[PDB]
Amino acid sequence: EELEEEEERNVNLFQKTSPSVVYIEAIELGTGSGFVWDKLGHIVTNYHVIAKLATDQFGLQRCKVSLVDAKGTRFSKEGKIVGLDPDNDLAVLKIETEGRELNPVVLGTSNDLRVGQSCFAIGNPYGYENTLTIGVVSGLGREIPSPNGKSISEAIQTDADINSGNAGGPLLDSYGHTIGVNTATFVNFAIPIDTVVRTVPYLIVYGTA
Amino acid sequence: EELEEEEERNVNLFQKTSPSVVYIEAIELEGTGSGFVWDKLGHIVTNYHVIAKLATDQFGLQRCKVSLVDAKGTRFSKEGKIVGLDPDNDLAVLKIETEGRELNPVVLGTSNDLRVGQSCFAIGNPYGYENTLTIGVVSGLGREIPSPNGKSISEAIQTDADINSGNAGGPLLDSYGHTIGVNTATFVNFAIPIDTVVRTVPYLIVYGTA
Amino acid sequence: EELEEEEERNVNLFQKTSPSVVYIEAIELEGTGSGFVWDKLGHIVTNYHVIAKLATDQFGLQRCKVSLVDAKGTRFSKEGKIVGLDPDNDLAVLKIETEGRELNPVVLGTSNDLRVGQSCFAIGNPYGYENTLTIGVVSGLGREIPSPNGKSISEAIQTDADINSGNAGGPLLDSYGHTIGVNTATFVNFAIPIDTVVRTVPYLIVYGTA
Ligand SMILES: [Ca+2]
Ligand SMILES: [Ca+2]
Ligand SMILES: [Ca+2]
Ligand SMILES: [Ca+2]
Ligand SMILES: [Ca+2]
């Protein structure tokens, strides 16, 4: 492109990662983002994003997930809760792929981050297009033994604008790897990808951390 | 300069484009805003909201002062007269008398070939004194809205360059220094795509409406 | 590193300048702020607003704790005493007892040759634990104000690097790691230009006032 090198990396990073980002609507008969964990149809998001569906339930609460498959085709499916972890603000959902091929994130690591490197936050703000915000890693939080709801252990602080429009979506590094999960239930913060890598396999298999 | 390459680009872009930026004061005999020079005749583009009371209320008192800079670098000010309005797309055109002054028109770019991730530069004139620069990326390219009506932009450019009152109505630029949109604030920040402006402004000038 | 050149400069700038940054707690026997190490003797520069109650209220209980890091990397804390105040330019100087600790003073730069569009880096210590980094550009270079008086900065540096309570009183830096300003928040973000601090701080130290 006739774009600068940095613009080129940004543009490419978005083209290759936004197909992993999903849009989540909490309907009552609350909106958020999430991302594709695997080809089976597991979706990671924030607990706050699906808080009513998981607690109120009451029978009426449903969960619609919109995304894109490997061909580029927008589509939508009912999302079922597989596991919750409100302590780390994590939740896993499962959709039925039904032969659709998904685009899983590429997991990175959060223990070797350095304050000053680029970070990229992607969300799906209104159900239509995905959105990109860019900043740096501003801070690497301290270890919090019992996080309890409103406190992230090892939180990644960033100055990439993070709001409701992209909470639950991935925080990426300059290689396009996912190093965190955007939150907003609480100057912006992500849950480190290392906490998610330790926890998500237990939510899938046991249904709790 | 001993500045990094990126700083150098930013510094030059601002030097070569800020002279196109104007400051707009809605006086009652309140509300301030930015706009930019469209051509050497003295046409100025801004937001409709920026000149809303002057255009709707009128009443008699409402005047319109425009401050800017000529090609020599000399600051100066003039009365601004409404030429056309397009509240649907949040656009307005004003006319000032140059009287032998040479202005610095923007360089129009295009907005249908933008890509999420490229750089954008928002320039305004926030308090009547110096121009201001904010830098971000194109965060989103909005969907088509056939009948925008007031508080909705068709093909809105979303950016994370900080956009406020201090620079509404001023230009959003790309890395070549071309204008690709118009900063709005009436509605996470949004610009009206320069393509909508390129189709609409010639009609505001010639007919006085879209 | 496998980091891009720009990330590399950012990462290094932070590593080499965050040890100069200090955390300031106004304890009543509240209000927190940042500041930075001016010299090896133990002088600390910050905002006046940050230590306002300790300087005006006093009463008796008001104390001032300062946390920082020595040249070996060891975190440590000390009582901080007011040396001089300058509320007109929102400046204050504090002194601590090093008692054989080696400190890390900022490297002073200049603010008169700044250009809108160059990079700037704001650093603070927001909750007493780690230091934070925010990155932007110089957005504006303010006009001269002969009598600033409280809520108005002469030659203010405007930036779009995020500036809040968590880093007020801390340094604003350029791409070389030099300090070009002091973050404020008592008043779109603003820093007090380092040139005003370079003229004023020697008087606060020696005479106790500007
Ligand atoms: Ca290129
Ligand atoms: Ca950059
Ligand atoms: Ca911001
Ligand atoms: Ca250079
Ligand atoms: Ca490298």
Numbering used by the authors:
A (entry chain C): 82 to 110, 129 to 285, 296 to 318
B (entry chain B), C (entry chain A): 82 to 110, 128 to 285, 296 to 318
Show the paper's wording.
These two HtrA proteases are located in the thylakoid lumen and participate in high-light stress responses by collaborating with other chloroplast proteins. Deg5 and Deg8 degrade photodamaged D1 protein of the photosystem II reaction centre, allowing its in situ replacement. The functional unit of the HtrA proteases is a trimer, with three protease domains forming a central core.
Deg5 is a distinct HtrA protease that is naturally devoid of a PDZ domain. His147, Asp188 and Ser266 constitute the catalytic triad of Deg5. To avoid self-degradation of wild-type Deg5 during crystallization, Ser266 was mutated to alanine. As revealed by the Deg5 (S266A) structure and ICP-MS analysis, trimeric Deg5 can bind two Ca2+ ions, suggesting a role in calcium events in chloroplasts. Deg5 (S266A) shows an inactive state in which a novel conformation of the catalytic His147 was observed and Thr284 on loop L2 interacts with His147 and blocks substrate entry. The χ1 angle of His147 in the alternative conformation is rotated anti­clockwise by ∼120°, preventing formation of the His147–Asp188 hydrogen bond, which is an unusual conformation compared with other distorted HtrA catalytic triads. The missing electron density for loops including L2, together with the distorted His147, indicates that the Deg5 structure shown here is of an inactive form.
